[PDB]
């Protein structure tokens, strides 16, 4: 049961918008294709895949009841990357840089969630 | 095997140093590994592989006799990428940007090659 809230509008028009523009965001635009990319254990490890394109479409179609759910999807996206990849891989550093911006934006979000 | 020349020193400390720091250079730091990257037709199509890491190592180990060899290795690297990939692939647009900077620095290289 979705919902439109001040916070979900902020997730869509500030958080996703800002991250999409970042030069490190492109590995996260689409779901990880483990066969195309030769990642044969990916779905054995990552059972809850998530990507920013999915998050964007979920916001655009009022999938979420609360911005907390959208923040959880972002956390799943980042942590899936942290788990699957090795602690020193470039993609982990890219994810960490995007998560830093994500947390900076979340900190400026309206702290009270109200339906529109 | 090789020697020091003013043009090779320029290739190392101007051309390669600049290109190595460029935002688009990272796909060219290492030989294309057609096994790890799942490129089963790469060596069918590309018979003379080259990459910037190999070029940089060759300069550091005084492998080259003349800068003409180093410039041709860059040409082979870039040309291979255009032969293998689609003109719409992002890697080809990255190669284009890098090749323009390469030719810019080449134009300002010392025009007469002397041994150092």
Residue numbers in the entry:
A (entry chain B), B (entry chain A): 32 to 147
From the paper:
Because of the limited solubility of the original peptides, we synthesized analogs that incorporated two glutamates at both the N- and C-termini of each peptide to improve solubility and facilitate further characterization of the peptide–BD interactions. The glutamates thus improved solubility at the expense of affinity. Two copies of BRD3–BD1 bind a single peptide. The acetyl group of AcK6 forms the same hydrogen bond with the side chain of Asn116 that is common to all characterized BD–peptide interactions. In the second BD, the hydroxyl group of Tyr12 forms a water-mediated hydrogen bond also to Asn116 (inset). Instead, Leu7 and Leu11 form contact with the WPF shelf of the AcK6-binding BD. These residues, together with Leu8, simultaneously interact with the WPF shelf of the second BD. Finally, we note that side chains of residues N terminal to AcK6 were either not in contact with the BD or did not display any electron density, suggesting that they were likely not well ordered.
Bromodomains (BDs) regulate gene expression by recognizing protein motifs containing acetyllysine. BDs are small alpha-helical bundles found in ∼40 human proteins that mainly regulate gene expression. These domains harbor a deep pocket that specifically recognizes AcK-containing peptide motifs in both histones and other gene regulatory proteins such as transcription factors. To begin to address this knowledge gap in an unbiased manner, we carried out mRNA display screens against a BD—the N-terminal BD of BRD3—using peptide libraries that contained either one or two acetyllysine residues.
